[PDB]
């Protein structure tokens, strides 16, 4: 399965999705800079509308514990 095919379900907790992401990211062998680009970009983009909304409110500069606690009720 390709990294672009990794997406969050409509009922799937973000948490279970983030695990899937760094597992597939774990099978990507690209430069770190590209993998940083993938992190800030693709993760949020394939996140579900309800959490996506939430993550837009965190702004930039956000870290994984704060994202992970931010989308917990969703």
């Amino acid at each position: 399965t390709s990294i672009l095919d990794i997406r969050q379900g409509p009922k799937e907790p973000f948490r279970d999705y983030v695990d899937r992401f760094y597992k597939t990211l774990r099978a990507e062998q690209a430069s770190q800079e590209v993998k940083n680009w993938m992190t800030e970009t693709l993760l949020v983009q394939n996140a579900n509308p309800d959490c996506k909304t939430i993550l837009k409110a965190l702004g930039p500069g956000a870290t994984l514990e704060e994202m992970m606690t931010a989308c917990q009720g969703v």
Binding site: R15, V18, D19, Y22, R26, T63, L64, E65, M68, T69
Partner: protein, 147 residues
């Protein structure tokens, strides 16, 4: 790990498979539970950075946590470099170089280099510095993963 031989010197010996597997099994069974930290601490007795990356890299599952830890290890390493600046002028022929955050993380150093620092007189406890970062990052995880 670096262990003491019968002759009375400190030499490196490899870690055992049923030790490896015991590390695996702990993680399988008790995931983020606090008992993991003393357990870790016992199984990390006399361990190298290199052996500590081996243990972290051999995890399967809990990849959100594994990434949070990595990022804590780099933060703690960035902080090592900040707090301890590089030293004045060129490195002496008679001496060996001071470590950076990445040598402590095992990344920029070789095994023989990791054995130089620990076995030499005075010895420097680069295991114990990484160990605190691991334990600190373990607290972060434990606190988050509390429900």
């Amino acid at each position: 790990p670096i262990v003491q031989n019968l002759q009375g010197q400190m030499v490196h010996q490899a870690i055992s498979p049923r030790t490896l597997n015991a590390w695996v099994k702990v993680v399988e069974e008790k995931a983020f539970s606090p008992e993991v930290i003393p357990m870790f601490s016992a199984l990390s007795e006399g361990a190298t950075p290199q052996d500590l990356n081996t243990m972290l890299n051999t995890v399967g599952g809990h990849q959100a946590a594994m990434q949070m830890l990595k990022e804590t290890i780099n933060e703690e390493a960035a902080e090592w470099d900040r707090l301890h600046p590089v030293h004045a002028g060129p490195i002496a022929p008679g001496q060996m170089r001071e470590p950076r955050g990445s040598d402590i993380a095992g990344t920029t150093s070789t095994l023989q280099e990791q054995i130089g620092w620990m076995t030499h007189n005075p010895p420097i406890p680069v295991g114990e510095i990484y160990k605190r970062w691991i334990i600190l990052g373990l607290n972060k995880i434990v606190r988050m993963y509390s429900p």
